[PDB]
Amino acid sequence: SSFTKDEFDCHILDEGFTAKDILDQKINDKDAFYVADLGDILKKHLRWLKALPRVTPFYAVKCNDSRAIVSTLAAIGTGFDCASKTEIQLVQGLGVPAERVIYANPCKQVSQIKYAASNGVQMMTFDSEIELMKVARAHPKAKLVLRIATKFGATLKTSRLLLERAKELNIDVIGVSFHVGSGCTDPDTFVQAVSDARCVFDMATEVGFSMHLLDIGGGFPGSEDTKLKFEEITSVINPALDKYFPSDSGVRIIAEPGRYYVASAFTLAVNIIAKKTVWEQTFMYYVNDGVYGSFNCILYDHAHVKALLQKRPKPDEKYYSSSIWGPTCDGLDRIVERCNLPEMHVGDWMLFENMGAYTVAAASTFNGFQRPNIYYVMSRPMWQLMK
Amino acid sequence: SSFTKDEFDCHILDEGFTAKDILDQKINDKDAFYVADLGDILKKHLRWLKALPRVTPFYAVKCNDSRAIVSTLAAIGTGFDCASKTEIQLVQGLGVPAERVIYANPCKQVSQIKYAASNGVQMMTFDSEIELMKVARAHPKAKLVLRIATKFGATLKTSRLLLERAKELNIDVIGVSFHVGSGCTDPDTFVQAVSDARCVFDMATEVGFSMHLLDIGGGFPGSEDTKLKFEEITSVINPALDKYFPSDSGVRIIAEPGRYYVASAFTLAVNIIAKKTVWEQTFMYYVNDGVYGSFNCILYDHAHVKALLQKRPKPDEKYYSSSIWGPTCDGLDRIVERCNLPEMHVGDWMLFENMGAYTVAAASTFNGFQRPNIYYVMSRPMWQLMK
Ligand SMILES: *Cc1c(COP(=O)(O)O)cnc(C)c1O
Ligand SMILES: *Cc1c(COP(=O)(O)O)cnc(C)c1O
Numbered sequence: 001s002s003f004t005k006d007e008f009d010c011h012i013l014d015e016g017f018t019a020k021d022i023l024d025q026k027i028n029d030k031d032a033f034y035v036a037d038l039g040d041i042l043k044k045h046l047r048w049l050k051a052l053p054r055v056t057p058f059y060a061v062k063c064n065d066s067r068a069i070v071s072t073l074a075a076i077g078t079g080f081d082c083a084s085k086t087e088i089q090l091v092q093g094l095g096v097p098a099e100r101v102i103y104a105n106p107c108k109q110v111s112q113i114k115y116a117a118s119n120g121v122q123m124m125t126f127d128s129e130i131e132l133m134k135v136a137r138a139h140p141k142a143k144l145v146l147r148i149a150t151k152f153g154a155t156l157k158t159s160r161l162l163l164e165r166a167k168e169l170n171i172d173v174i175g176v177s178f179h180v181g182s183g184c185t186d187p188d189t190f191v192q193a194v195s196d197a198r199c200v201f202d203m204a205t206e207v208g209f210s211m212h213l214l215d216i217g218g219g220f221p222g223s224e225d226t227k228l229k230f231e232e233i234t235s236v237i238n239p240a241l242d243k244y245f246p247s248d249s250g251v252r253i254i255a256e257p258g259r260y261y262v263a264s265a266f267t268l269a270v271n272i273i274a275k276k277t278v279w280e281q282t283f284m285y286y287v288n289d290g291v292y293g294s295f296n297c298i299l300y301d302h303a304h305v306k307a308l309l310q311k312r313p314k315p316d317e318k319y320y321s322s323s324i325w326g327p328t329c330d331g332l333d334r335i336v337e338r339c340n341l342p343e344m345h346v347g348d349w350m351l352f353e354n355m356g357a358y359t360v361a362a363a364s365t366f367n368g369f370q371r372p373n374i375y376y377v378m379s380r381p382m383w384q385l386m387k
Numbered sequence: 388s389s390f391t392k393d394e395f396d397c398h399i400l401d402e403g404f405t406a407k408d409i410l411d412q413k414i415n416d417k418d419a420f421y422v423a424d425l426g427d428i429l430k431k432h433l434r435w436l437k438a439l440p441r442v443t444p445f446y447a448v449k450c451n452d453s454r455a456i457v458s459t460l461a462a463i464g465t466g467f468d469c470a471s472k473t474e475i476q477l478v479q480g481l482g483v484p485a486e487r488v489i490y491a492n493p494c495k496q497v498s499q500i501k502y503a504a505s506n507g508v509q510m511m512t513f514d515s516e517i518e519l520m521k522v523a524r525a526h527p528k529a530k531l532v533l534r535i536a537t538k539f540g541a542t543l544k545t546s547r548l549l550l551e552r553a554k555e556l557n558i559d560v561i562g563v564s565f566h567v568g569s570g571c572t573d574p575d576t577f578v579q580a581v582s583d584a585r586c587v588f589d590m591a592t593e594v595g596f597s598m599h600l601l602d603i604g605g606g607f608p609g610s611e612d613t614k615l616k617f618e619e620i621t622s623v624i625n626p627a628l629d630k631y632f633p634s635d636s637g638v639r640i641i642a643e644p645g646r647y648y649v650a651s652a653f654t655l656a657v658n659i660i661a662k663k664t665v666w667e668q669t670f671m672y673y674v675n676d677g678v679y680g681s682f683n684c685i686l687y688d689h690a691h692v693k694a695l696l697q698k699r700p701k702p703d704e705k706y707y708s709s710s711i712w713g714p715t716c717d718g719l720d721r722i723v724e725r726c727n728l729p730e731m732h733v734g735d736w737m738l739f740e741n742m743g744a745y746t747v748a749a750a751s752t753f754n755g756f757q758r759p760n761i762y763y764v765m766s767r768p769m770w771q772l773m774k
Contacts, residue, residue, distance in 0.1 A: 029496075029498040030497075030498065031498075062715070062754040065755070082755075083715070083754050084714075084755035084756055085755065086755030087754070104716070105716050106661075107660065107661030107714075108660065108661065109416075109417075109658075109660045109661075109675055109714070110417075110660070111416040111418075128661070128662070129664075130661060130662045130733060131661065134661075134733070151712055151717075151718045151721070152716075152718065181718070271496075273494065273495065273497070274493075274494030274495065274496075274515070275515070275517045276514075276517065277516075284538075288496055291687075292687070292749055296751075299687075300679070300686075300717070300719070325538055327471075327496070328449070329449060329470045329492050330687070331538045331539065331568070333538070334538070346517060361751075361754075362679055362751050362753040363751065364683075364748075364749050366748055366749040367449040367471055367474070367748075368449070368452070368470065368471035368472065368473030368474040368477070369471055369473070
């Protein structure tokens, strides 16, 4: 059972078959491939509506720009955080209205600002006086959001000057945004950011702006590996929002989650293409995706990946010190430096879960190695819910 | 004046106009762009024929796979070092015969080995017993080259065992390859590798192979920044080749240069899209290519880039501590951490020379930021010579 829409095919899971079961079915040229569970994205959306009922999510497209993902999120009602002309074209090309887009790049090429003005995208961020000069010339009627620091972010000591400069240029400033990021292992950083945002809203009132938009950014975890759970963060954000930004004020609260929505939806299957033995003693395994491909996340996103075997465990099997390398002819294309694994063979598969964020979006075809095909799946109940 | 061939356009330089002059002419949307001097590649080829007259160069396609570069090198007579099916398809698609290709990837996917066998590519490298098992099944008549260590490389202590295993499998082993790499700042490492290769040729004679192919790998510098000059390396390699591999023996010597041929041929022009001032005191400049794009070389190739201004110097201008950042909405997309520069403005260009190697080949469109267009140029004298 399958369905087609927005130039993608999606298999519908019927019994109690899960995305993991489909993966096994495909394994039962042997190029690496992904199984992407669109149902996991709807699950994440329901969980978001429950945890942060006052906060509208604007998906950060740069995390994973796969057409099916963006199509799915659009269908379920998210907004989009776009940072370039291409990202805006992607979202508008899927039928999403300009009002559901925030151009949340504080430092934008002037031609790309002109593109947003021409296509009706009015909401953009900024954090510098030169950005205001550019907006004055290229999108004078835009609705600006001041990005504050917790590369980017205006200090509280310098925000007042920017707000006065915006008023001098007759630019409307409608709110404040911040981005804590995923590195943070403390929910209190989000709380302090909300408090800093309220200070800036009050400064803006003194300058003559009646701000109404609070954007709490991204960094929410999308996988279970992370120590700090999503609901540990949201449970402390909610009281801060109620304290500093009561609903009676007319304020609109939004966020820019990326990895939250898509990290766990993608599982990557790679095949063991080559193998060396350094003396049964230690083993080196070469696989058909690597650091120039999906595992660029180890270098750009500081991600921590974990190799899982696809075959079922065996009683009392022996474990050996092993290393896992990518397919390129580059000595630094190494995925796992040292791990303990049973003896594996060429043609065997290894699985890498929680591979949806900052993976496919930044992969290249360096050395001619192609991108893994992505197979989409969705449970029957989730398929019905989306419609 | 221009010419077209193999789906690319090339401007012919007429007066005493140089690639740098064309760059200035184009500057006189403002997207980043490259100027690639195909004449510089022919210059590099002439310099190679002079410096290493007994060594046939097999260009390492993975360095820079731009169609015009591969087309040019084919036209002037190089061989090609390919590491994947896609790379082989590229070279054969430009009309290069299988005899001018080495499949110099020691750890290859079995389907890709089958592809090479089907398309007549017989010469491949290896460095492990499992690789021999794969070749026995998928390309039994291949001509193998043993890659020795100076991820890859058989030790001298383990090469004899491999050679015996190849004989047991009725696999023909025709030679030895090594790869010193570009990190090396000493020409004596190349000399020791040649001596180690001769030890392996003698071991192979004892086992029953009459080796004839010596492959000296890559790592030769393609830019003037490098301390160790090309001719400093070649001047010590030649006597080693004459000592250990006399021409009277019938030996064929080849190499796999990548960066040598193309590093200096490409100059990247980026525009300053955004700017911040941290207090006239210090300046932060944002440009329209970055670490997910052309400057991935800083992370993957450990490259050292240097920002040059495009505008002409002015008398007694003031210099300031500055930082240069890429266009993405990623806090680590930083190109130059600290440098001293005059005050620059949005719309001004910065130039990055010696940007041909390991740059465009590994760039992505992460965050929607597009790849810079490449404009090809060639002097009149070089155009004539190539034909
Ligand atoms: C990348 C980024 C996001 C998305 O971050 P996640 O960690 O994927 O949630 C949101 N906003 C900004 C400004 C970003 O730079
Ligand atoms: C990458 C590489 C080359 C090319 O290296 P350069 O430093 O670009 O010359 C040649 N041979 C092998 C085996 C390589 O891995």
